[PDB]
Amino acid sequence: DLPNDGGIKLVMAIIRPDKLADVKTALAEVGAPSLTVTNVSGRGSDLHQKVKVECVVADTPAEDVADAIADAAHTGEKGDGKIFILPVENAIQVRTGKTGRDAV
Amino acid sequence: ADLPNDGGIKLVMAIIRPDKLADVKTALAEVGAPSLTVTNVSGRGSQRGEEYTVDLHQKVKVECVVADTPAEDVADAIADAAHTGEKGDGKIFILPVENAIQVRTGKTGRDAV
Amino acid sequence: DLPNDGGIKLVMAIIRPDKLADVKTALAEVGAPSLTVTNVSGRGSQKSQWRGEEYTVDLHQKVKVECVVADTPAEDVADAIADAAHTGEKGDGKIFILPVENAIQVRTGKTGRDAV
Ligand SMILES: Nc1ncnc2c1ncn2[C@@H]1O[C@H](COP(=O)(O)OP(=O)(O)OP(=O)(O)O)[C@@H](O)[C@H]1O
Numbered sequence: 246d247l248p249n250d251g252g253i254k255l256v257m258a259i260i261r262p263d264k265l266a267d268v269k270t271a272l273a274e275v276g277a278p279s280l281t282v283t284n285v286s287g288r289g290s291d292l293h294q295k296v297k298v299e300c301v302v303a304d305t306p307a308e309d310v311a312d313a314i315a316d317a318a319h320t321g322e323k324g325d326g327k328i329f330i331l332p333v334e335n336a337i338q339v340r341t342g343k344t345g346r347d348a349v
Numbered sequence: 350a351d352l353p354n355d356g357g358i359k360l361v362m363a364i365i366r367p368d369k370l371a372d373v374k375t376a377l378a379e380v381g382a383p384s385l386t387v388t389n390v391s392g393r394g395s396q397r398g399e400e401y402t403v404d405l406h407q408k409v410k411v412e413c414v415v416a417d418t419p420a421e422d423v424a425d426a427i428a429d430a431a432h433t434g435e436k437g438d439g440k441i442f443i444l445p446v447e448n449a450i451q452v453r454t455g456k457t458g459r460d461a462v
Numbered sequence: 463d464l465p466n467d468g469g470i471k472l473v474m475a476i477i478r479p480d481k482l483a484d485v486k487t488a489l490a491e492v493g494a495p496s497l498t499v500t501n502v503s504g505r506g507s508q509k510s511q512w513r514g515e516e517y518t519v520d521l522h523q524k525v526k527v528e529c530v531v532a533d534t535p536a537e538d539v540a541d542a543i544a545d546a547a548h549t550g551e552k553g554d555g556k557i558f559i560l561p562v563e564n565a566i567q568v569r570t571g572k573t574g575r576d577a578v
Pocket residue numbers: 259260286287288289290293295322323324325326327384385386387412413414415451453462
């Protein structure tokens with residue numbers, strides 16, 4: 246009975262640069278340590294420096310990964326950022342050539 | 350009720366000219382969806398020398414996640430502001446978003462955007 | 463009879479920085495040369511406490527390649543990138559294919575799969 250309804254999701258988080266370390270630890274602890282980080286800038290509702298964290302998940306429920314990031318990135322002040330979950334159709338593991346959720 | 354984006358969430362991703370960022374920012378504010386995330390990127394589009402075949406040109410990736418504003422209106426606002434009429438103007442893509450979380454409050458779904 | 467079931471897909475690849483040149487060539491050869499590149503860093507899946515410490519603090523430099531496709535099957539684009547980026551060692555990265563609903567060509571105002 247597979248998480249993410251047997252499929253693959255991209256968890257994209259825009260967070261405070263100084264919260265990256267915590268988020269990395271939280272991802273490891275939740276059992277989905279894989280991430281890709283980009284230096285970015287933006288604004289919510291003159292651009293502020295942020296970090297975009299991307300985690301593609303299959304074995305771990307996307308919401309649990311997102312909640313792990315949210316908790317670790319939370320301060321309670323404006324600028325904490327947002328997390329978005331996008332569908333992923335397919336994945337390929339470059340080293341092996343394995344496909345689908347098994348490649349994640 | 351008639352919520353835009355069929356009651357859901359969309360990611361508007363635009364690859365534009367670096368010097369068009371200021372205009373795009375203004376256009377986004379004016380259309381009522383000012384939120385954006387910017388990345389410095391490089392790329393090339395479709396097919397003598399190396400200029401328009403192999404080399405990568407500096408661009409800006411603009412990402413806007415929307416719910417209250419129709420994705421197409423946000424995309425049109427970016428397109429208009431980024432337009433010059435010359436090769437290199439870039440492209441805008443709209444991707445589905447399933448779910449969202451506002452980190453400060455823990456609010457979820459379309460309300461988080 | 464249109465590829466990608468008549469629709470649009472985003473091919474996202476996280477690869478070794480030194481494999482970018484090869485991937486660019488492979489994309490041209492497969493007939494879908496369009497790409498957007500970002501400098502990124504990350505880590506993959508998880509004995510000693512030092513190599514365990516190096517994991518929890520250290521991110522490795524990678525390149526994110528993004529190709530939005532319509533006329534070329536997303537899998538063929540992904541396979542072209544995979545082949546060119548392959549070394550057989552840990553760190554080779556991964557390729558993800560995401561659905562795309564719509565696209566706008568900024569220059570012309572053309573929309574849909576035709577804008578890709
Ligand atoms: N809808 C969105 N689309 C794209 N990027 C966003 C969006 N919302 C937030 N971001 C990114 O997250 C960063 C901070 O977001 P945040 O929501 O904290 O802004 P804010 O104006 O402080 O809002 P709030 O007061 O509700 O926290 C922004 O700099 C931006 O890069």
